[PDB]
Amino acid sequence: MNTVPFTSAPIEVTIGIDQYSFNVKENQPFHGIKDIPIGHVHVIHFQHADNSSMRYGYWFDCRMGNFYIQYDPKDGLYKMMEERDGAKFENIVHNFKERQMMVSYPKIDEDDTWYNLTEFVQMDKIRKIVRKDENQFSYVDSSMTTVQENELSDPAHSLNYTVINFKSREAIRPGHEMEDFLDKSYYLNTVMLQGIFKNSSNYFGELQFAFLNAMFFGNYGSSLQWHAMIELICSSATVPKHMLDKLDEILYYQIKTLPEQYSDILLNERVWNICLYSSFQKNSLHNTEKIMENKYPELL
């Protein structure tokens, strides 16, 4: 069980850690989150009390280093930092724990939610979408735009998701125009899976990281990326059976975890009605279709 120590909490802030959130008051004695389960990525994120503009946060893996948060009053945000001195870190955490100033990641034992949302997400791939290589952790916020978005203006602060575009030459073989546009199996299996992602675990990883950035930061281009990757599988007549089964489970948990009040902005009517009711895979997403009907029948 790992720990993220906070130098202090000088401004009133809502703090999220994965799917949970809590409130800290201005200058409340607060020095961290403890008992963070090892073996998953995590995200710690922030919504300031004064400015609900800009949700922001850090993706990180405790196995990759000792990380802490200290507020920066110049840039006006809680920043993640790495402490390279192993025993200085241990000694800092131990005093915070002894003084019982850290909140506890309240994982219910029955609860596989975070594993299910992050099954294929790996820090090494996160760092390739979010290029900032001096750090082992990755910053994201509400306003960051995607590479594809900027093709339609600071590159250093972009989300380098894999560009998907159904009306592109990448996607459409010369002389297979109608075929490839109505059955995207070529573009999914040969271009994306074999060529670009190498395997379906990497593809699902990006899909899951897009959904999480959309939900936690309301990153609009992440949401576009999540819907795009779903639609590409659903619009492909030929998909490995194991990918469809996993996709159903992937989506089931995303849909399960989405706040009921955010469904208007984060769910795309066309994509969902097409995937669930019109596409090749309309009959291959039983769990996802059942929860979508019982929870968001309005959208459909």
Binding site: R169, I172, M178
Partner: protein
């Protein structure tokens, strides 16, 4: 974006452009089978591709053999239209290729766009106008070449005949749309109007009769009367 009444003069400027109408590409006669079921039997069709400024018509004849063994033919027809338009473009010298192609039906946008990805600087646009290009098979010489075709074939016409020697493209397009609207609302009467007296005749190299200026006014008036009427005869007014 879309083409409508406000940006109407754009058609007649010096940017090369084509309309594409696909309404006669896939044509069927529906009939009963021996067993008392229904079956379609297709007949030859055509893509109506027209330069509105010059009047050059590229009439690609769609022979029924193209549908042999195919499923979802109404959807295939939109992609077949798009394949043939894109090939036409590719066959043209660069300086003759269109800067825009305007489809008369929005369902042609995706198929044409996908077939034209190599031409990123050719704009594919819809239109809000309700153009009567479906009545192009009411023109006898066009209907003839289509029905006689035993194979795929491209025939070139000027749908304005020699009109441009005397009138502007704007006026020539307006006469054409009026004749076509008339043929669409009541083909018989429109046709009765056109060849009223044998002194006026259709030249071998033309589609429409050789009318004087003064006779085109009389005809245009008779076509408007026809069109307003049928609108009465239809809504009772």
């Amino acid at each position: 974006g879309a083409m409508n009444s406000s940006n109407y003069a754009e058609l007649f400027n010096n940017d090369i452009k084509l309309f594409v109408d696909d309404t006669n590409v896939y044509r069927v006669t529906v009939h009963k089978t021996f067993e008392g079921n229904v079956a379609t039997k297709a007949i030859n069709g055509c893509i109506f591709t027209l330069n509105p400024k010059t009047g050059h018509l590229f009439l690609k004849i769609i022979h029924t053999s193209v549908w042999a063994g195919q499923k979802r033919l109404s959807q295939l027809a939109k992609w077949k239209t798009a394949e043939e338009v894109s090939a036409l473009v590719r066959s043209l010298p660069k300086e003759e290729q269109p800067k825009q192609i305007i489809v008369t039906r929005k369902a042609m946008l995706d198929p044409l766009e996908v077939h034209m990805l190599d031409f990123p600087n050719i704009a594919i646009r819809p239109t809000e106008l309700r153009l009567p290009f479906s009545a192009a098979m009411s023109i006898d010489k066009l209907s003839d070449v289509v029905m006689k075709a035993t194979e795929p074939q491209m025939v070139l016409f000027n749908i304005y005949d020699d009109w441009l020697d005397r009138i502007s493209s704007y006026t020539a397009f307006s006469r054409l749309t009026l004749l076509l609207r008339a043929l669409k609302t009541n083909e018989e009467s429109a046709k009765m109007i056109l060849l009223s007296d044998p002194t006026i005749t259709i030249k071998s190299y033309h589609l429409w009769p050789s009318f004087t200026d003064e006779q085109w006014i009389t005809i245009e008036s008779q076509m408007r009367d026809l069109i307003l009427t049928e609108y009465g005869r239809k809504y009772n007014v």
